[PDB]
Amino acid sequence: FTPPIYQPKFKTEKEFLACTAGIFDAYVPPASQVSIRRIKDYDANFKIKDFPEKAKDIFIEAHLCLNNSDHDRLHTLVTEHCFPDMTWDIKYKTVRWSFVESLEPSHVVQVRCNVYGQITVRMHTRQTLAIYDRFGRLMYGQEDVPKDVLEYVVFEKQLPYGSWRMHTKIVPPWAPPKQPILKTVMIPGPQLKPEEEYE
Amino acid sequence: IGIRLTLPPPKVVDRWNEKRAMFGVYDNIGILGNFEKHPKELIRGPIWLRGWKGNELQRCIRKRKMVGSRMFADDLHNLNKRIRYLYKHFNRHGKFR
Amino acid sequence: VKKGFRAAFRFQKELERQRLLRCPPP
Amino acid sequence: ARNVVYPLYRLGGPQLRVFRTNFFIQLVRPGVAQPEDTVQFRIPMEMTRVDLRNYLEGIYNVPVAAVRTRVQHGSNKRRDHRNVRIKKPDYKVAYVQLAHGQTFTFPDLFPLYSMLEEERQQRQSSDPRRGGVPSWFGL
């Protein structure tokens, strides 16, 4: 007789901040000299009469970066509070945003104020949008026909090495509805449990 | 699959470090220094095989003879067993007589 | 890991050849 | 006292006195219903019930009527990632019945973020009519 040999048990017992929370004082579209001084005393070099040009340049350059998904530059171009909005829904789809000559010159609206800057700038420009799918089929906006855009863009700055970056775009309730979407959509009603009846 | 999928990290060799640059120096210490020192005295290594060479059995015999008293207990037991085995193999095995 | 470089480089060359066959450049 | 050699007593010797007690005890909430005059303690293993009675009557002036003790075994069943048993410590439990009709009940102990909260308020969830199109753009 040969006794059985047991294998070791282990073989078989194995088991598997430089941002702010939104807007300090929300501007409502149809006396900020204190905040003007509160930013001048800390920056020591600023021009309100020249800021809108820089704001427009930063805005347009960031929108161009969105075309090529230049996230490395977009991080510096826009605030971290705004970056998920900028780059989340646009992921896995090509956007063909382009800029054309503006309609009216950009101007500052109001400014307020460990310490974070804030500048609300009004623009009425003309832009083009064409958002595609993963598969390269258009789903939003004609690429050729431009549209007129009215925007109230609020910039935030860090107060030592930070700059003025897009923080939040204010959409007024009276703003016209956006462009319609090519594809149709179904919106389900309230789901019913077995004991529930539709009313 | 018995092949690595990436290139190994590059191996840089300094051919002109001090060891390589001065390798061979004093190998002629005898014939160029009036034979005061033999070149084998330049050899650094185990005390039992400085300026000496032999097969494994001769090496083991020499190691036991020269440092056997300083060897650790189980190392010396292993050396004794190895000498016994090598004696049997070299004196009783092999193709030739 | 096995020491050596020549076999790894040969495998890289064969991978490059296969890649050129599978997705030849325009 | 614990982890100290007790001086050996011989008949007619002095009273054994401890001046800086090494024993630290915990008053614990009973896991089961207990009489109103019963208080549960977790005790060092080297502490006798006489020691506990004197400890409570001297350091806390608690009139103690009875003391009972039991050694609760700590589970040795749990095993770490190396299959080595992890020993939960054994510990002594004392049940102390207060004197003179005194009653005890365990007291009811235990009776950036702003930016995250306001962003969660301002999530602005995508509307179903948007169909996955990013609503950030003003066009």
Next chain:
Amino acid sequence: WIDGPKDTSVEDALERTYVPCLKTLQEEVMEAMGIKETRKYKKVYWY
């Protein structure tokens, strides 16, 4: 810093009440608390 109910005042914490003596804490406390012990500690063997 504001002291809590269980924090010593600095003057109390720094009061040097220590009188360097040749008495152990045990016998000093026995004298202080008035405990009287007349029994003599019988000798034991150590080994």
Next chain:
Amino acid sequence: ARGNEYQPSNIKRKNKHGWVRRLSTPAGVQVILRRMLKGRKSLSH
């Protein structure tokens, strides 16, 4: 029928393989010494 040769009893275990019995003879002392040399966590039973 077979296999249950182990009929446990702590008295027998300690009296047969315990520390005291191991130390009771020079051979058992060498048993303990070998276990200590090997690094056994359990020297005796």
Next chain:
Amino acid sequence: LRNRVTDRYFRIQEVLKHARHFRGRKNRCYRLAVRTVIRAF
């Protein structure tokens, strides 16, 4: 493991390439492939 073979992949592939059009495991497993490739040659 002072000296280990690192070319065994290519040594195996030299035979497997000739075995690739065979039926069954003779086209995959070197032990079986080499016998049938020798017979083929």
Next chain:
Amino acid sequence: GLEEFFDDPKNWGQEKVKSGAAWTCQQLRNKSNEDLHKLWYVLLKERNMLLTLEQEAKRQRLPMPSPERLDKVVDSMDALDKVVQEREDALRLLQTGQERARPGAWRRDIFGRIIWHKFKQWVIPWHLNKRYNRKRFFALPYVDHFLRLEREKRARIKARKENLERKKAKILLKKF
């Protein structure tokens, strides 16, 4: 009273309880023996309360309010014990010259190892103690080989460690 096992009722449920600093050895060295005696029980009652809090927090599956209080109290009691031990050690050195409170001796056990045998208290002398005489404080010659083997095991471990240290140092030098 049993209320001393719990914090002040105002503190029950507070996420944080403000506490001072742990007594330091130097701070305690200025206090009298009586003062240390009383502070020991003050700290002991605080320690009991904090241990009660810790256990109740575990029971309720809640974090303990200001857990560092327990660390502070343990440190204070350790410092007090060290201060009292220092005073007793100095007194013992002065009056007896003994650096150790408990008697002992260097002895060779049955396994050939040198140990510090701490003496125990007995009522009968050692030559009469039956249990004591069963204990063997000598090593017979069969232990010498195992002593050499243990020494060589230690030597091998030390040599491995030192060689590893030197190799790591060489690797660091080559890297930088």
Next chain:
Amino acid sequence: ADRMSKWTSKRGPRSFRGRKGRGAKGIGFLTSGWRFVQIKEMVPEFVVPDLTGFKLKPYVSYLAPESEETPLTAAQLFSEAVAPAIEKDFKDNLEKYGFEPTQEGKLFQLYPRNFLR
């Protein structure tokens, strides 16, 4: 069969479980009939002081100044406790200064230590 788990009094037969303890120090002895006689002097009597009016507290204010640790030594204790009297009597039998030739005869013998803590 469990060689690794600690040997406690919960493990053996009835005699084992009765004989082994948990480290508690003995309080008395057993007489005939297994009657336990408890010796009062064997019971540790807690010498608890009166804490009424005590000013020290479990914690120290952070406002207290930092200091350098200077562990007490035999030399320091001698200097601060015996040296003054020695000098005053030398300028003008060591038992007068505090020294005792032997610890025998004392309740609290320093060596071999015969008191708790």
Next chain:
RNA sequence: CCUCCGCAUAAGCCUGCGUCAGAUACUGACAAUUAACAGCCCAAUAUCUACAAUCAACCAACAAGUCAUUA
């Protein structure tokens, strides 16, 4: 519809279907078995003790059966 089953002690084992929270009687945390039952004994020195048990009374024997106390 079923069970020489069940409940306790001993021995053995050592937290191994208690609660909660995560998983699919597992993991983690929390809790728990309270001495009167049982164990852990005896201050010694001497000296004492022939007379079974078997309902212990008859009858029945041989294989001749620890009972350890007192000054």
Next chain:
RNA sequence: GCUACCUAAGAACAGCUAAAAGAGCACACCCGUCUAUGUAGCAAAAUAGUGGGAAGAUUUAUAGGUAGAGGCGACAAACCUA
């Protein structure tokens, strides 16, 4: 810590028949005659039925003892951790 034998101190053995029994029938308990199943099984010797003993040279718990050319053996070269 199985098993063989032994030591110390325990325990169990219904009912009927018989009458102080190595007595009869037959539970518990011990065993293992015959058959069947099982044959990597429930089981590295089991199950079901049947059967032998069942106040004794009985069965059995606890602790101890005898150790390898040795032990132990109502001798089967049986048993001494499958």
Next chain:
RNA sequence: GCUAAACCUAGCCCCAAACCCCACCUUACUACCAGACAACCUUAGCCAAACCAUUUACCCAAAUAAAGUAUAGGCGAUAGAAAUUGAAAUGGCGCAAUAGAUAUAGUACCGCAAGGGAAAGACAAGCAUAAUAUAGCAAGGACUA
């Protein structure tokens, strides 16, 4: 496209140098009563001699040389001196996770016990995509196939 596949240091090897609180022998890890028992004593055998029976190298206290010499020896297998002579002094043509230590560890686990003793961390095979067509070592010659 699954399963996988791969990796490099965790350490190890060989040298050199240097000589390296409490508890616990009772049932170890057990606070606390009459000790006394206290140790010493050729290795054998495997194996070689083609069996085997005498015999058959084994930490020696300077390597080399004398010298495998004198000697010993079923004078055979084999064993084998000495007189004499007088050597100076931090590294790797080592391994790189089946290797190197057994070692992540003498752990887990196995054993009554003495003992034994692991594993592992960073498009291979097998399948699927896509079952199969008369005939046969499964291929070769081929063939438009």
